[PDB]
Ligand SMILES: *SC1=NC(C)(C)N(O)C1(C)C
Ligand SMILES: [Cl-]
Ligand SMILES: [Cl-]
């Protein structure tokens with residue numbers, strides 16, 4: 001297991017434009033295209049992201065290319081954020097992946113707002129951090145995925161992704 005395999009499990013792989021769990025146009029391995037309700041706007045974003053006229057369909061290689069860019073972008077967002085970088089730096093590699101996963105799903109600013117959870121993670125109070133992370137819109141709207149990410153923070157193991 002690693003961050004790529006982890007997010008591939010959590011996000012799936014679809015080669016045609018679909019709506020994510022928030023209703024937003026998405027493609028590939030959880031590549032968010034736009035929050036606009038306009039499918040034409042989403043298709044325009046897709047063509048710009050891939051560099052050709054796709055008509056809303058891409059290949060597996062193209063999906064994996066966007067995915068690698070998106071994982072890279074999540075890590076860069078952590079490293080440039082004054083609240084996320086100290087927590088990231090304090091974590092082992094397994095828990096770092098859990099933080100990258102959250103930033104991939106909700107964005108840098110969204111995760112940086114989890115001030116009390118971040119403090120508990122910085123303090124390595126793992127059970128308390130896990131409890132606090134579940135008091136969230138995130139957990140209520142995507143509980144099975146949040147439970148996997150939270151278990152990864154609680155234990156520092158890949159047990160929540162093992163048989164998947
Ligand atoms: S939430 C929560 N915090 C403690 C560690 C006290 N718990 O046992 C729960 C209920 C999981
Ligand atoms: Cl330490
Ligand atoms: Cl709490």
Ligand SMILES: [Cl-]
Pocket residue numbers: 134135136137
């Ligand atoms: Cl709550």
Ligand SMILES: [K+]
Pocket residue numbers: 010011012020021026029030
């Ligand atoms: K998805």
